[PDB]
Design a protein around this ligand. Structure first.
Ligand SMILES: [Cl-]
Ligand SMILES: [Cl-]
Ligand SMILES: [Cl-]
Ligand SMILES: [Cl-]
Ligand SMILES: [Cl-]
Ligand SMILES: [Cl-]
Lengths: 321, 321
């Protein structure tokens, strides 16, 4: 019986490039696609949401079991909400590269990687509905990259978006993490960043890469990267919060899950190093603040309203609401 | 200053299949993606919108020049609106086939095909904004098919959607036309079909294919198809309206545009044949009812509100509002 009072809504492509062939003909690609809604009585700073690998805006929309996601929850709380499909993903599938896409039979691997459970079993107490239809939805919210992964291309489009809409808050997920870290260096208009379970390319000062950053992922990439000191200092300039969920394993028997344990450890080190240089980085491991059973997608888990309340609280204390 | 009062909104995947490999592992693909909004005080029958080739739900969203589209207009008029990305398109990019995608330098050809003008010139009086940013948006609302064109796969997902949401009205565009014609044969829940500039696979009774249907398109497909008489009779059972815009050329010097002239002619023949068998098919050529300058996308043209009023009127006379 509640009602979302939408003052404005719409969609647009943002950013991208233009290829030009030998005849002067154009190809417009590599933009992001954005759908936005502005509530009546909107707060000063919009929220911009960025998904991770294999996913799209649906990350933040209806949950796989049919409940409201952050798109609806934050609109109801009077934030302008911008949902994005990054370059080469979903509705932004018009990339600039030639590419071959083939189905991969790794759905059961993703179940584990997302810490829903160890397939075929769900984790005890997991904040995820256990029926077949929910899982059907969960696998069908994946969509392929129509090209190669390129954080420069991705972050360029998000910078173009922040430049367009003005100062806002960037809410990211997983590989959205390093998209976020890159985008910060490209726009004045990011006021703050909240990231859910970031992974990849954590920036440390050259010569100060912590031992805990030197592990190489399953994706064959080193987790931490070295950046010049003046670039590292840019991450001290806005408030940052990072959230990790539950069922982080204690041993490395299954790297698909243990990588998340390593990431929690690493982000705490990263936060400490930035805070020692005057930053404002908070890392929250959800069970330690009373929320148990979260997966890699806390924004769509069964307790996602409680997850949203934590975010609203932080936004409030940073005067971003 | 107007406000859309949204009682419910959300998104889901619908339809699709499941591949199963030799090890019993799954691949869920070929679903459509749907975003829906239900207004306060919604009318009895939802509107379901289906795009054509190379496009996605954006067909019906914000126009390329930044004005409201049918998504907003019909929600404001108190219809539940379901916007769809059909299987293998956009957010529904998780298809079941291996495919190679490469950029094609045919943007200037599409400009002509859509009857905005003869590139580089706009048609005199065309209902399309003539600035660069508008055209940028127009090209970036294209997205590739992640697989092959298959009307069975497409129409199966739309049938699954109509089965899910109950009796509704199907609003289609271009190749959405034959998707519509196919979907009708697969669900009880289509109350009516409105189609903007349909093209392809127009069904006629076996042995009664009109001469005007026998032309082979640039896509190397015959425009009319032969179906059994009992199947042809299915198109008599719901009201159907078909709209064509302006700048239909009189001669065949440019097949990219003349195909639309042939289609207008053909749909009038099709309507006559169905109406003679008890159907209710109306074909409207927009200039002949006082709307001039429409392109192949009348729903997003400068006079799209007037285009919407025509549709609201028809819906009203068929008791579908
Ligand atoms: Cl991942
Ligand atoms: Cl359950
Ligand atoms: Cl594993
Ligand atoms: Cl076409
Ligand atoms: Cl103009
Ligand atoms: Cl031409």
């Amino acid at each position: 019986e509640r009602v979302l009072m939408v003052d404005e809504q719409g969609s647009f492509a943002v950013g991208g490039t233009v290829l030009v062939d030998s005849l002067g003909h154009t190809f417009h690609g590599d933009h992001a696609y954005v759908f936005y809604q502005k509530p009546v009585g909107a707060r000063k700073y919009p929220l911009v949401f960025a998904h991770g690998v294999g996913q799209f805006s649906k990350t933040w929309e209806t949950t796989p079991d049919g409940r409201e996601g952050f798109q609806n929850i934050f609109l109801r709380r009077r934030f302008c909400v911008y949902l994005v499909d990054q370059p080469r993903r979903g509705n932004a599938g018009r990339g600039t590269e030639s590419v071959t896409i083939s189905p991969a039979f790794d759905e059961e691997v993703w179940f584990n990687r997302f810490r829903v459970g160890i397939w075929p079993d769900y984790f005890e107490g997991v904040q995820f509905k256990r029926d077949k239809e929910t899982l059907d939805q969960y696998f069908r919210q994946m969509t392929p990259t129509i090209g190669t992964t390129d954080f420069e291309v991705y972050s360029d489009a998000y910078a173009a978006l922040f430049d367009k809409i003005g100062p806002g808050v960037f809410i990211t997920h997983s590989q959205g993490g390093p998209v976020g870290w890159n985008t910060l260096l490209k726009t004045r208009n990011i006021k703050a960043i909240a990231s859910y379970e970031p992974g990849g390319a954590v920036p440390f000062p050259e010569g100060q890469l912590p031992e805990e950053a030197k592990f190489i992922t399953l994706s064959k990439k080193m987790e931490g990267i070295e950046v010049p000191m003046s670039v590292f200092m840019e991450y001290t300039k806005v408030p940052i919060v990072i959230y990790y969920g539950d069922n982080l394993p204690e041993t490395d028997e299954r790297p698909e899950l243990y990588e998340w344990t390593r990431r929690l450890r690493l982000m705490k080190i990263w936060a400490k190093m930035l805070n020692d240089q005057g930053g404002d980085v908070t890392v929250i491991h959800l069970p330690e603040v009373g929320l148990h059973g979260n997966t890699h997608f806390p924004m769509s888990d069964l307790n996602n309203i409680e997850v949203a309340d934590l975010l609203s609280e932080w936004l409030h204390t940073k005067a971003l609401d």
